[model samples]
Target: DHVDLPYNLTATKIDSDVFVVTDRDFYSSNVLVAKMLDGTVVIVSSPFENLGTQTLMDWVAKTMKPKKVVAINTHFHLDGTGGNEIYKKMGAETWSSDLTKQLRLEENKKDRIKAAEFYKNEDLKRRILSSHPVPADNVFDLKQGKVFSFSNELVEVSFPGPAHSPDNVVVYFPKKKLLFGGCMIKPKELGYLGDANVKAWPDSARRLKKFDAKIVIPGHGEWGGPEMVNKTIKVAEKAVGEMRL
Candidate 1:
């Protein structure tokens, strides 16, 4: 038997224009942030709670001083969007995939409850919920295969159809020549099956290929080049394939 625990507190300058802020320290996934040419900051994904985000946000304020901020949730998970409220206070507009908005409308509180239950921590629950408000003030219902532009960046936020979650939307930044593959693939680890959407896993990676990005920033583990993304697709297919079998 073997034991492998996910890494904690990982942060990397994943690419020239992006940073991957991970929170394995609190047993959560990595987060993605994009700093554009005009200094608009776009945040994607968060951890179980934003307690860890204070320092990061402070850094952004001092260093980035982002003009327009928008937070994008890969889905309706506490680990993905839990710290959004803090970003809101930092003067950033918050948004998510249209599907995530729908889930919020349904009163999806799965992550909020899970985190509180996992730690029996009342403060944790309060911070996570109160910080992140529902009915996201902004939502993007991306055309299935079209490229959406923001500032000077061209974006393609696509849905992976229930793999990591019911509303997992993977984001791509064409101008920066990078792709933020939020938990859609973990290059070299046992796939976390708890929230994976098995049936649509394969096509999700295939659809991502259309972007032809030079770099891939994942929600977990090391961010790597195109090869990493390719390896991720293969690794994910094998894991999900065997699980289905």
Candidate 2:
């Protein structure tokens, strides 16, 4: 049933200029799109590579009418960085942590080999191989906190240590009191901690609580309030306790 289902990409407005983009794929991570004061668009994360997912780019181009597009991948995972090359191909400037750049570049090398061996269809194999991530044009220091000025607003970028991945970071919008938690912050119901640093997850969750965000947009699942942080911390602590035994 899902295979034949039409591609459905949606954008939910969080503020006048900020929107959360979602896809039909059950496991797909949400992408963030925000408009700057100058009409440029800032994209966080990328959708999966497929015909249906390509509509996300089309929607951004047609509706946003952005003078320039700037994209940032929060981590090295495909759900976050897969579209780096897609946006780059569309003339968007891409940025990420130096560690993320190094990780994805190395990860893609292995992915390409796997894709070639696993896929039988030529077109499918080509797509998989091509979707391998490319390095961001601009890389930042993960150890230092940085502020980005766009849309006449400041977006605070912070590395709350590593929980989800070695290069994971979170993007916070002080103006909207919103935090794009990336993969480090999970929903209240909890989710899988794939490729996570379980030992550090609790600390990372604590760091996230320090940010006084009214709303938190997690990497997957629904958005929530500060309680989400508490929930995730509990999950992480439980994971740690179980592993100890």
Candidate 3:
């Protein structure tokens, strides 16, 4: 079966049994939905805005054929969680840190104001508000230094102090040897520290070095190996180091 999106999307087989879907459209990013050999499904992000829910479901039904599904929200941005309602309708359970839940609420409130002020498309504004109309269901409360598990994989979820947003969580997949460093970046890029801690991301990334991850899956931009994971740590290291200077 063939799946089509714009040329902006770059798809890859993360392992013998996993596939990743990524899109790098300026500040816009894509998501990764992986299907394991045992019939479990994992979703990294929900980068669908203009992409409709029907098309998204069609892609998931054809590509993943997931039995059980779980989602990892990279940050507080609506771009990541926008497609969640569609997945929920398919019986996939959505998961995110408690902090993310709180931030989602905050965004909902703020978007109401921003949507009206910036955009003049009444219909589009109404559609967005109606689509993500509700809040999150079955969201997780993260405790730093704790691990989240699914399908024999241990996901070490952590927050990098306050960089990016107060609710960012980094997920490390032990079995697959992957680290989903949400928005935390490496030397090549700076984390989205505008709404987050401008100083903590580097130290936060450095701490991730303790984990042995072969592949580093980013929330935005390209994929890197363990070395890139280290690079993310170094990016944070540089940011914090520069901040000190």
Candidate 4:
């Protein structure tokens, strides 16, 4: 059964301050709601975009009443940056790589056109067309990356040289030993490859291994441990090797 959280979404509590929010749609995309050492809440990934991010924020207001909300998108994909506009309107600061910002608008343009032609429902098409990532309020160099601090804790966001998308990045919390693998690191075998850098997947995952996260929350599917990186590496290498021939 699905959880009774907002927007027909469910959240699995990873800790008192950490929750993994997910939906029941075709993507079943996973989102993260993490309360930092301070009262500020950091949400990563937008998932179902408009409704999902709004409802997730609704839950945050109801339960934590965070001092502030910061949304860190992992990539340019709709599943990651779709909520940028919503977050901005709700008074949350948004952050991502400059490349991510560039790519988000580019990709969303393509997605909207495709959805407009594919979906028959006018309301659904309208929602899909309207729901997309707006420009990130703040940006960092993707290659150099950036580090964010809440109170005394450090949240490191790094771009591992392209995996799921050219601009994909991962978020890490050193003290908590938690990592947001984004769409690059998978909980199981390879998932989506439409815009993926298949050969770069393993290398990107290797960059993630250096973090040593005990709790790894992937972009989709279940959240697991560091082994998820190795598993994704193994699967990617095998799949890429096959594609070569």
Highest lDDT: give the candidate number: 4
lDDT of 2 by residue, 72-164 (tens): 889888777777767877888888888989998888888887886788899888876765667778888988966888746787878898888
lDDT of 4 by residue, 1-245 (tens): 13577556888888768888888673667888889878989998786567777888888899778999999988877777778878999999999999999887787788887896799898888876665568689999999999988998788889888888889988888888999987887646677788888998888788887887998888888878889888888888887898991
Q: Give all candidates' CA lDDT scores.
A: 0.66, 0.78, 0.65, 0.83
Q: Higher-lDDT candidate among 1 and 2?
A: 2
Q: Return whichever of 1 and 3 wins on TM-score.
A: 3
The true-versus-predicted C-alpha distance at residue 164 of model 1, in Å, is 1.6
Per-residue alpha-carbon lDDT of model 3 for 15-45, expressed as tens digits? Answer: 7656556554645354666665567777766
Pairs of colliding residues, candidate 3: 98-140, 162-197, 163-197, 164-196, 186-232, 202-236, 202-237
Candidate 1: clashing pairs of residues: 8-24, 8-25, 9-25, 46-79, 46-80, 162-197, 163-196, 163-197
Kindly indicate the candidate among 3 and 4 with the higher lDDT.
Answer: 4
Top TM-score hit: 4
In terms of lDDT, the poorest run of 10 residues in model 3 is 1-10
Error of 3 at 194 (Å): 2.2
TM-scores, all candidates, are 0.77, 0.87, 0.81, 0.89
Q: After superposition, how far is residue 26 of candidate 3 from its true place, in Å?
A: 4.7
- Which of the predicted structures, 2 or 4, would earn the higher TM-score when compared with the native? 4
Tell how far residue 172 is off in model 4, in angstroms: 0.3
Candidate ordering by TM-score (highest first): 4, 2, 3, 1
lDDT of 3 at 238: 69
